[PDB]
Structures are given as structure tokens and as C-alpha cells.
Paper text:
To facilitate the cryo-EM structure solving, we use an engineered Gq protein (GqiN) in which the N-terminus (residue 1–32) of Gq was replaced by the N-terminus (residue 1–28) of Gi protein to render the protein binding ability to the scFv16 antibody that has been successfully used in solving numerous receptor/G-protein complexes, including the M1R/G11 complex. Also the long ICL3 of H1R (residue 224–401) was deleted to improve protein expression and folding. Indeed, the NanoBiT tethering strategy greatly improves the composition of the complex, and the structure was solved by the single-particle cryo-EM analysis of the H1R-LgBiT/GαqiN/Gβ-HiBiT/Gγ/scFv16 complex at 3.64 Å resolution. The alpha helical domain of Gα cannot be resolved in our analysis due to its high flexibility. The structure shows that all three histamine nitrogen atoms establish hydrogen bonds with the surrounding polar residues from TM3, TM5, and TM6. The primary amino group of histamine (Nα) forms hydrogen bonds with the D1073.32 of TM3 and Y4316.51 of TM6, the 1 position nitrogen atom (Nπ) of the imidazole ring form a hydrogen bond with Y4316.51 of TM6, and the 3 position nitrogen atom (Nτ) forms hydrogen bonds with N1985.46 of TM5 and T1123.37 of TM3. Compared to the inactive conformation of doxepin-bound H1R10 (Cα root-mean-square deviation of 1.235 Å), the biggest difference is the squash of ligand-binding pocket in the active conformation. Calculating by the CASTp 3.0 server, the solvent-accessible volume of doxepin-bound H1R is 249 Å3, and the histamine-bound H1R is 79 Å3. Indeed, we see an inward displacement of the extracellular part of TM6 (2.6 Å measured by the Cα of A4396.59) and a dramatic outward displacement of the intracellular part of TM6 (11.6 Å as measured by the Cα of N4086.28) upon ligand binding. Based on those observations, we postulate that the key mechanism for receptor activation is to squash the ligand-binding pocket via the hydrogen bonds formed by histamine with key residues of TM3 and TM6.
Author numbering:
A (entry chain R): 28 to 221, 405 to 485
B (entry chain G): 5 to 62
C (entry chain C): 1 to 121, 134 to 248
D (entry chain B): 2 to 340
E (entry chain A): 3 to 29, 36 to 64, 187 to 238, 243 to 359
The structure:
């Protein structure tokens, strides 16, 4: 069973790096700064994905059934949706902060302070935490409340094309388009021509890598469940597991993307690699 | 220049006053300093912490 | 020197309304809390009202709560005490009293000159007791005065919130000793404090004829501040 | 040539000094303190955090009663705290927001602050008006005023960028004696517990021990290579300790007139911002630029029990007069009192 | 709460103190410090007072309110002490404004003024204490430069000039280039300008300059540079 070797590795490292990033910040000083709050929020969300969300998908790709039972399925779905949504929203708030940073003379009304940053993380995580209700909202999708299927544990809104489209609009496509808008504005800001002629190329490398990782990771899942909104012939369980695994991959990739290129973290990683 | 001569005279006087010092051998100074640290050793809350009953900082 | 002057001492038929004004000149009024203390003709000082700095908190004695009002005008540096439905049991002198609270402060340090308010036609607090009412004194002698409390004022943090005030004939009370051992500015070293717990001692040695007066104990543990009846020292 | 003769005579005087210093060096401190019981792992924890400053905290000083605590920040404000209950007692705004140091007078009445305005201001705390106002503005320096300390109700010692210290008489407002003899700027100052002598180290790697009444330089200590910017006597006042940009603290002896011991970490290449001793003088607590603050064994020169609680450089520190607690103040606008 | 009476009052007073602190912080947290420098009695104070007029040993501090931000020019430098252990109060400053007088050329004690001034300029621009701060440069009084061009050639004191006898624009460009070259191998962004009395735009550039400076640090924190 080769897959259990690979996927488990992916989750086992996913904790480690995130935890290593976490242990990097909450232990060492000089990093106790503003943007590292965003970094640690992203890393915490990804650690939750790696901890409470990945093993259950390991159980699917290992077992033939959700052997856990209904309340465990509800809890796992809650944690997966909340943690993935919080990861996306945390990346989005980090992007909007960078855009405000590079577009404005200063966060000049005292906007850069740590208390407001922490408030922003709290708000983003809250708006993600509203994902708790709909999974426990079986009293709005009455057409499927007596429906239980073996192949999946039945997220219980999978055939609601209306709510599903609205979710995809308000959750990933709007933030991703705004992400692209903000980073394009940042790049058009960098282009000063007054480091000379290499600043632009370095900025292109970094920002393109960021946005490309995000979009390539998180399209094939959102676009595909927007597809199952009407496709009944997609044998959709297999592509579901593949795409959601691609979506989880971005969670373990983030520690190597955002926090790796801020303070270079080299001394920290070398000192505390052993947790 | 007379200013340099005056500065040199001041320096020479300073060094002369630094010469007529009844030096104490470093061994005696170290022994005295260590004995002092020993004598008031029990009276140091940063070295022998006070029980919480008599600690104003909880 | 600092200065407080009060006004509004009208003579009214009972049940009426009045206003009393304490104009401050000579200190930063915006940083001091203020009290209002009352003196019946042949009784001791009793506490009436308190308004803290910036009007953050306000406290009243039980005998007056919901009946008196108190207010501060910071830019004009003035203190108001508005009276509604005044009983005949309020005909009294009123002293506007300064007060600052911080570590090492000296509350009740300076007092207004007082104004007369003549109108004619409790429990679960502390009470102070005066073992005597007067003491026979030949000048130059060493004497002392003893106060008692129902509750030991020595709080948990080591402070003892007991104050001693002197009132010479014809003047406002002036603070003698705050927190039972610390004497105020301008107080000759003759006076000193002693005792503990529930028995408090003001000891004066080499008494001077200028020191003849009436001595008062203030507890200050509870905002229902309770003065003692106090003892009148007399010249022999 | 008179200049050449004077220089030559100074040269053989220096040679005599070196010969005498070598002759008296029959051992080093670490040769006699090897057989002493080590302190052991002692960890102190942040008991209070005094917050309310907005910019970095530049210096601080405990009162004599060891409870009150005056701290001066880049905010252009001094704040007089109550370190037992964290309540601010006073907040003093400044005429010039450029304050580099402070001082709480031993009587508890006056607080001194000075800085780039070349003037040491003496704020009077215990007044009728209930506010806190300058009672004297001590001017007479030309350079920048580094560190000023009190001796009594009327005599305050200052050290400035004139490469000079001064013994100001507050009541009259003019310096009684001026201590000259440094070359660099006198970046730090310290007073003997008996206040008969003080000491000061300068931006020339040298420290100098000054007499208050005689006004003539008693002796000079060298051995540092970068700027001595922190000094605090061993509590008996017969020894002495400095911290410099050498990533090194040094302990000198006032009767041996030579270096006594050193404290350093090779991996540390950053400077030192303030030192102090404990009440028993056994521990040389020193801040550092790496945001930490070490607690050296001031006798064996071996400990790394670090007061690590600050998110930026530890600027100033000290111990209470009775030694219950140390305090530190760092560039993160927080004063943390450790015990 | 086991606090006694006076303890409660003390807490209230400390809250009042914190209230006043917050009120002053409301303007203190948005203030930038811009260290103003110059040598030769060129009149740096006069130039700052001129900005104060244009739009609304000693230290003189000049507030500016630009686009809902408070700048605060710090004017110090009349002291001759060993400034290394006194510029510590300016270890992290937003920018270092350096004023030069262009009229200094072929004008002396016994030495022409710009050699000393530019030695001072390079000394400041190369301090390790100031590595994170941009350096702004204000070449003041150019009308008198034009007047002196009708008299004095640059080659009369600095032989390495090359250009027409009365090419004022060449003079400005050469002098600005002269001050730019002393920027060391380090990649520090040295700003520049030429101001005049009616130069109502020059103040804006300081704001503009500071903008870019902060922008640079941001990009320098995100490794986009
Ligand atoms: N598999 C990721 C679940 C999710 C959350 N939000 C949108 N989709």
C-alpha cells in the first residue's frame, strides 16, 4: 500500500514544518513583530489541517467507509472546512496587509499596530468559524436528511448548487481575484527605475511564486465542486479526494513560502530544528 | 605651543598623584571581596530567595 | 499658599433647595478629588459627600444619599453641592476639603474656610469612640489622646488608614497626622502617633499654647468615613 | 624642550605604574575563586509589567525606599511608578522631549532628568500645588548630558558631553567643582554607597574614580577597548564594575587599582547597555543588546541565567536598595520587574 | 477586589494618567523624526523657518502636517562633542536631511567650505549607526550661485571640474554628482534637490522622499529587494 507511505509523510511533515514555524516564532524574539502575527496565524491554520483534518482522509484512502460514525464525520467536516477556510482567509488578510503596506505612505492613522493586526486575525478566523453552522444545518437542506451513503460521509449540502455556488463566490473566488488585484498593484508600485533593474525581477519571482502556488493549489477543488453542483456522472468521489488532497498540500507548502522569505529564519531553523 | 606644555604638565601631575598610591596586593583584595560576599550572603533576595510570606512581589 | 473659598450660605425655610460653591485658587484643581464635610453647632465633624478626580466616582453618606448632589467644574475650578429638601438637621458649617490619593500622599491636607447653612422655622460601618471629652492641661506638659475603633483599621497591606485633625477655636480643621504615624507638612515635630489595631494614640510632648484645640480621628478604610466626636483640649 | 621632557617623565611614570601593577599581581581572581561554592541555577520570573510608555525607555532608577520607580522614555515623559501595585504615581511631561537619563533623589522629593537640551532639570514632587514642576534648570554644560545622580537634597552630580562631570549645587544653581581629565564623552556614572567618591567611564575605553570633596582624579582604570557605557559599584564600595561594547563586563578593584575579572561570551559580539550588582554583590546583572539580560556570577564569572522577557533591547536595569527585586526597562516600552 | 479605599482611589488616578497618556499617544504614534544636519553657518535653521512660513548649541523642533501625517524636523548640531555617543537617541531615524550651501564654492578659517562640509557629509552617510535611514540632500541658495557664476569659475578651487565658464546648470549637476559619489559601496538611496525661496514644491518632496524610504523598508522586510 504505497499511498499510506506518501500521504502520511505529507501530513507528518505538515505538522512538523508548521510546528517548527510555530516554535520558531513563539520561542525566539526579534520575530515578535507585526507581520509574523499573520505568519503564525497561517501556520496555526495549516497545523490544524495537518492534525485534525489529514488523518481522516487517510482513513478514507485506507478504509472503504467512514468507520468513525456520524458525529465524528460532522466534527471532521467542521474542522476541515473551518481550517481550510481559515487558511485561505489568513493568506488573504496577509495579502491585503502587504498591499496596504506597499501602496500607502504609512498605515498613518496608527494602523500598523499589533493590537489591530491581532484583531484582523480574530475577525478572519471568526468569519471562517461561521462554517460551523451549515454542516450542523440539516434543517435547511431537508431533501437529503434521510440520505446516507457508504462512499462518503455525506457533507449534507453536496447537491445544493445554490448555497454551493454562493460559498464558492464568497470564499475563494472573491478572495483570489482580490489577491491578484492587490499583488498586481504591488508589482506596479515596485517598478520605480530610480538596487537597479534587478528589483523588478526579484519581485516578480517572489510574488508570482506566491500567487501561482495559491491559485494552482486551490482551483481544482473549488472549480470541481462547483462542477458536482450539477454533474451526477463524474464518479466524483475519487476526484474529490484527489482535489481536496491538492488543497491540503498548500497547507504544508505555506511554511516554505510566506514565513521562509521574511526574516530568512536561518539562525532560528539551524538552532531549533529538533523541536 | 604653551597649551600643549600645560596639558603635559597636568598629565604629569595626574600620573605623579597616581604613583603615590599605597597599593594593596590583589590577593588580599580578592580575599576581602569574597569574604564580604560571604558575610552578607544570606541577606540577598536575588541569591537566597525569600519565602513568599515576606515577598512583596508575590 | 493655596486657597479655597465657599459661598451660598443662605438662610432658608425647611425642605427648600440651595447651592454651595467652593472656588479653588492656588493649585491644580483638575487633579484633586474633593470632599464635603459638615459640622453641627455643638457636635463633631461628620462626612457628607465625595467626588473623585474627573468625576470618575462619587460617594455619599447614608444620611444624604439620593438627597444631595455634587459636581465639579474643572475649567472654572469650582465645586458645587446642590441641596434639595433640606431638613432642619442640616443647619451647620460646611467645609469643602481637598484630597489627593497616591502612594505617599496626604489626603484631606487643606480645607476651605467654611460656610454656614442655617435652616429653621445606618450600621455596618465603623464608629470611633473618644475615651474622654476634655483633658486638663497646663502648657508645656506632655499629654496624649486615645481613639478606639470597632474594626481594626490596619489593612492587609500594612497601611493603617487613620488620620488626626486639629481644629483651633475659630478656624477650619487642619490635618495633623495621616496614616497614624506620618505627620503633614507644616506640622511641628511635637506631635507623634502610636498604638495599633483598634487603639490609636496621638501623643504630644511640650505642648504649646498655640496647640490648644479640638482633636478628631478620621478612619479612612470605608467611604462611609466616620469622624470621632473628638476631645476639646482646654487651657488651665 | 619642556614638552618633550614632560612627555618623557609621564612615560617613565607610566612604566612605574605598570611595574607596580605587575608586582602586586600575585594571583588572579579566578585562581582563588575556583574553590568556592557555585550559586547554581536560579531563575527569576517577571512579577509585574509596567506598561504605559509609548516609545523606548531610556533609563530608570529606584527610589531609596525601593518601591517607587522613575522611568524616562523617548516619549518626552517621565513616569513615577509604584512597583508593588503597578499604579502610576506621577506622569511628568518634559520641556524638551529629548531625555537620556533620570534620577530619583534619595529623599524622595526631587526627580532629575536631562538630555540633548544640555540641561539637567530638577522636578519637585512634594509640593502644595499637587502638580510636579521644575524647581531648578541646571545649565552650564556645552555637550550632551548623559547621566546625572543625586547626593543629597542640594548636591547633584552630572556627567556630560563636555568630557566633564560636574558637582552642581541645586539650591544656588551653579557648579561647585568640575571634574576634568577624560578624553571621550563621560557616558556613565556611579556613586559610592557612602557618597564620598564617585566614578565615571567615558567614550575612550577608560574609567576614572573621582573624589567629591577634593575634586582631583584619584585613579584611572584601563583594559577596555570600546566605550564604557555602564557602571555600578560593588555594594561595599571598594570594588567596581563596567560594561562596554566589547561584549564584556569587567570588575576592577579600587584598592588593587587594576582589572580584577572579566565576563564575556564569545558568541556575543554585541554591546552592553547597563550593569548592576545584587545586594550581596555576588551577582553582576547586566543587560545586553541581543534583547536578553544575563545574570553573571560576579565572583566566579560563570552563569547564564538570563532574564529573557523583552521584545527589544534591554536599555536600563537595577536592583532595589534592599535587594528584593531587580527591574529592567527595554526598548519595547515595558518595565519588567523580576524577582 | 481586596483593595482598600485609598488603593481604589490610586487605581482611579492611574487610569486617569493612562487616559492622558493615550490622548498624547494619539498624536505621538504618528510622528516621524527626521534628523536635520548641516555645517558652515549655511542657515539650516533659516531654511526650516522658511518652510514653516511657506506652509503650516540648541535644539529647535519644527512640526509639519503633511497629508494627515505629522512630520517633526529636529534641528540640532550646534554642539562639537563626540557625537557618536550622543546620536544614540537617533539610532533608528526615518531620514537624515543634510543641507548644503551651494554658495560655499571658492569661499573659505583657511579652507574652502565644501571640503569640510562634504567630509562631514560622508562621515554621517557612512556611520554604522544610521544604516537603515535614507539620506536626503538639500542644496540651498542657488540664486547666489548664479550670481557667483558671473564671478567665479569652479575650476578656480576644484580643478576636476569640466564645463563652460558660466554654465550654471553644469555647476549644479557637478556639485550634486560630487555629493552623490561619496555614497559608499553600500546601496543607500541618496535623494537630492535644489531649493529656492519660492520653491513651494520642495516641502512636498520631503514627504515624497519619506514615502519612498518607508516603502523601501517594507520591501526590504518582505525580501522583494
Ligand atoms: N476541502 C476543503 C473544504 C472547503 C472549505 N471551504 C471550501 N472548501
Amino acid at each position: 500500500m504505497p499511498l499510506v507511505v506518501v500521504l502520511s509523510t505529507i501530513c507528518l511533515v505538515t505538522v512538523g514544518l508548521n510546528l517548527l514555524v510555530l516554535y520558531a516564532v513563539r520561542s525566539e524574539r526579534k520575530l515578535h513583530t507585526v507581520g509574523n502575527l499573520y505568519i503564525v496565524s497561517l501556520s496555526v491554520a495549516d497545523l490544524i489541517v495537518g492534525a485534525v483534518v489529514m488523518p481522516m482522509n487517510i482513513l478514507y484512502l485506507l478504509m472503504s467507509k467512514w468507520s468513525l460514525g456520524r458525529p465524528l464525520c460532522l466534527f471532521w467536516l467542521s474542522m476541515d472546512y473551518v481550517a481550510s477556510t481559515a487558511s485561505i482567509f489568513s493568506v488573504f488578510i496577509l495579502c491585503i496587509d502587504r498591499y496596504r503596506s506597499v501602496q500607502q505612505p504609512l498605515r498613518y492613522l496608527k494602523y500598523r499596530t499589533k493590537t489591530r493586526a491581532s484583531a484582523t486575525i480574530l475577525g478572519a478566523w471568526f468569519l471562517s468559524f461561521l462554517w460551523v453552522i451549515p454542516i450542523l444545518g440539516w434543517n435547511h437542506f431537508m431533501q437529503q436528511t434521510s440520505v446516507r451513503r457508504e462512499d462518503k460521509c455525506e457533507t449534507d449540502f453536496y447537491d445544493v448548487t445554490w448555497f454551493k455556488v454562493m460559498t464558492a463566490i464568497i470564499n475563494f473566488y472573491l478572495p483570489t481575484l482580490l489577491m491578484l488585484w492587490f499583488y498586481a498593484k504591488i508589482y506596479k508600485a515596485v517598478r520605480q527605475h530610480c538596487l537597479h533593474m534587478n528589483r523588478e525581477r526579484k519581485a516578480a519571482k517572489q510574488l508570482g511564486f506566491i500567487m501561482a502556488a495559491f491559485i494552482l493549489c486551490w482551483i481544482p477543488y473549488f472549480i470541481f465542486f462547483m462542477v458536482i453542483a450539477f454533474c451526477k456522472n463524474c464518479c466524483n468521489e475519487h476526484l474529490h479526494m484527489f482535489t481536496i488532497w491538492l488543497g491540503y498540500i498548500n497547507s504544508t507548502l505555506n511554511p516554505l513560502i510566506y514565513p521562509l522569505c521574511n526574516e530568512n529564519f536561518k539562525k532560528t531553523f539551524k538552532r531549533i530544528l529538533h523541536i | 605651543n604653551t597649551a600643549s606644555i600645560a596639558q603635559a604638565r597636568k598629565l604629569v601631575e595626574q600620573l605623579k598623584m597616581e604613583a603615590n598610591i599605597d597599593r594593596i596586593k590583589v590577593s588580599k583584595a580578592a580575599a576581602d571581596l569574597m569574604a564580604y560576599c560571604e558575610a552578607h550572603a544570606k541577606e540577598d533576595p536575588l541569591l537566597t530567595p525569600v519565602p513568599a510570606s515576606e515577598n512583596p512581589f508575590r | 499658599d493655596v486657597q479655597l473659598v465657599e459661598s451660598g450660605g443662605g438662610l432658608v425655610q425647611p425642605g427648600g433647595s440651595r447651592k454651595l460653591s467652593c472656588s479653588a485658587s492656588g493649585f491644580a484643581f483638575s487633579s484633586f478629588g474633593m470632599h464635603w464635610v459638615r459640622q453641627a453647632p455643638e457636635k463633631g465633624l461628620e462626612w457628607v459627600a465625595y467626588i473623585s478626580s474627573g468625576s470618575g466616582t462619587i460617594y455619599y453618606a447614608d444620611t444624604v444619599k439620593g438627597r444631595f448632589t455634587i459636581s465639579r467644574d474643572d475649567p472654572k475650578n469650582t465645586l458645587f453641592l446642590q441641596m434639595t429638601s433640606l431638613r432642619s438637621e442640616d443647619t451647620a458649617m460646611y467645609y469643602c476639603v481637598r484630597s489627593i490619593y497616591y502612594y505617599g500622599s496626604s489626603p484631606f491636607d487643606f480645607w476651605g474656610q467654611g460656610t454656614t447653612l442655617t435652616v429653621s422655622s445606618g450600621g455596618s460601618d465603623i464608629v470611633m469612640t473618644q475615651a474622654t471629652s476634655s483633658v486638663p492641661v497646663t502648657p508645656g506638659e506632655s499629654v496624649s489622646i486615645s481613639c478606639r475603633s470597632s474594626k481594626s483599621l490596619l489593612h492587609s497591606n500594612g497601611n493603617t488608614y487613620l488620620y488626626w485633625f486639629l481644629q483651633r477655636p475659630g478656624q477650619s480643621p487642619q490635618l495633623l497626622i495621616y496614616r497614624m504615624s506620618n505627620l503633614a507638612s507644616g506640622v511641628p515635630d511635637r506631635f507623634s502617633g502610636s498604638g495599633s489595631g483598634t487603639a490609636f494614640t496621638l501623643t504630644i510632648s511640650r505642648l504649646e499654647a498655640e496647640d490648644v484645640g479640638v482633636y478628631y480621628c478620621m478612619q479612612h478604610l470605608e467611604y462611609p468615613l466616620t469622624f470621632g466626636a473628638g476631645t476639646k483640649l482646654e487651657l488651665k | 624642550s619642556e614638552l618633550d621632557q614632560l612627555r618623557q617623565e609621564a612615560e617613565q611614570l607610566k612604566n612605574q605604574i605598570r611595574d607596580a601593577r605587575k608586582a602586586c599581581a600575585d594571583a588572579t581572581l579566578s585562581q582563588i575563586t575556583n574553590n568556592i561554592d557555585p550559586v547554581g541555577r536560579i531563575q527569576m520570573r517577571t512579577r509585574r509589567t509596567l506598561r504605559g510608555h509609548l516609545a523606548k525607555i531610556y533609563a530608570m532608577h529606584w527610589g531609596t525606599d525601593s518601591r517607587l520607580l522613575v522611568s524616562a522614555s523617548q516619549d518626552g515623559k517621565l513616569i513615577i511608578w509604584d512597583s508593588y501595585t503597578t499604579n502610576k504615581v506621577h506622569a511628568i511631561p518634559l520641556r524638551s522631549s529629548w531625555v537620556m537619563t533620570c534620577a530619583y533623589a534619595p529623599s524622595g522629593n526631587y526627580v532629575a532628568c536631562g538630555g540633548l537640551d544640555n540641561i539637567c532639570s530638577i522636578y519637585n514632587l512634594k509640593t502644595r500645588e499637587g502638580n510636579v514642576r521644575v524647581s531648578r534648570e541646571l545649565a552650564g554644560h556645552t555637550g550632551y548630558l548623559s547621566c546625572c545622580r543625586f547626593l543629597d537634597d542640594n548636591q547633584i552630580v552630572t556627567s556630560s558631553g563636555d568630557t566633564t562631570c560636574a558637582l552642581w549645587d541645586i539650591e544656588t544653581g551653579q557648579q561647585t567643582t568640575t571634574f576634568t581629565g577624560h578624553t571621550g564623552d563621560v557616558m556613565s556614572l556611579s556613586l559610592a554607597p557612602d557618597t564620598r567618591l564617585f566614578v565615571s567611564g567615558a567614550c575612550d575605553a577608560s574609567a576614572k574614580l573621582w573624589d567629591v570633596r577634593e575634586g582631583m582624579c584619584r585613579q584611572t582604570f584601563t583594559g577596555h577597548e570600546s566605550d564604557i557605557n555602564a557602571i555600578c559599584f560593588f555594594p561595599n564600595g571598594n570594588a567596581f564594575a563596567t560594561g562596554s561594547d566589547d561584549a564584556t563586563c569587567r570588575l576592577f578593584d579600587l584598592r588593587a587599582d587594576q582589572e580584577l575579572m572579566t565576563y564575556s561570551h564569545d558568541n556575543i559580539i554585541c554591546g552592553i547597555t547597563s550593569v548592576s550588582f545584587s545586594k550581596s554583590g555576588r551577582l553582576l546583572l547586566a543587560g545586553y543588546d541581543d534583547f536578553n539580560c544575563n545574570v553573571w556570577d560576579a565572583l566566579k564569572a560563570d552563569r547564564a541565567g538570563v532574564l529573557a522577557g523583552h521584545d527589544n533591547r534591554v536599555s536600563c536595569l537595577g536592583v532595589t536598595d534592599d535587594g528584593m527585586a531587580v527591574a529592567t526597562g527595554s526598548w519595547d516600552s515595558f518595565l519588567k520587574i523580576w524577582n | 477586589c481586596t483593595l482598600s479605599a485609598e488603593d481604589k482611589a490610586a487605581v482611579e488616578r492611574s487610569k486617569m494618567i493612562d487616559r492622558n497618556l493615550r490622548e498624547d499617544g494619539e498624536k505621538a504614534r504618528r510622528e516621524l523624526k527626521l534628523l536635520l544636519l548641516g555645517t558652515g553657518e549655511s542657515g539650516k535653521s533659516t531654511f526650516i523657518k522658511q518652510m514653516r512660513i511657506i506652509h503650516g548649541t540648541g535644539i529647535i523642533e519644527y512640526p509639519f502636517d503633511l497629508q494627515s501625517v505629522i512630520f517633526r524636523m529636529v534641528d540640532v548640531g550646534g554642539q562639537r562633542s563626540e557625537r557618536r555617543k550622543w546620536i544614540h537617541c537617533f539610532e533608528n531615524v526615518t531620514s537624515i536631511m543634510f543641507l548644503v550651501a551651494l554658495s560655499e564654492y571658492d569661499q573659505v578659517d583657511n579652507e574652502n567650505r565644501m571640503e569640510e562640509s562634504k567630509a562631514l557629509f560622508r562621515t554621517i552617510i557612512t556611520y554604522p549607526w544610521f544604516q537603515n535611514s535614507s539620506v536626503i540632500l538639500f542644496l540651498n541658495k542657488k540664486d547666489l550661485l548664479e550670481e557667483k557664476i558671473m564671478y567665479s569659475h569652479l575650476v578656480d578651487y576644484f580643478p576636476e571640474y569640466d564645463g563652460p565658464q558660466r554654465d550654471a546648470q553644469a555647476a549644479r549637476e557637478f556639485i550634486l554628482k560630487m555629493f552623490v559619489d561619496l555614497n559608499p559601496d553600500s546601496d543607500k538611496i541618496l535623494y537630492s534637490h535644489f531649493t529656492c525661496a519660492t520653491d513651494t514644491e520642495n516641502i512636498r518632496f520631503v514627504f515624497a522622499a519619506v514615502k519612498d524610504t518607508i516603502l523601501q523598508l517594507n520591501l526590504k522586510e518582505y525580501n522583494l529587494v
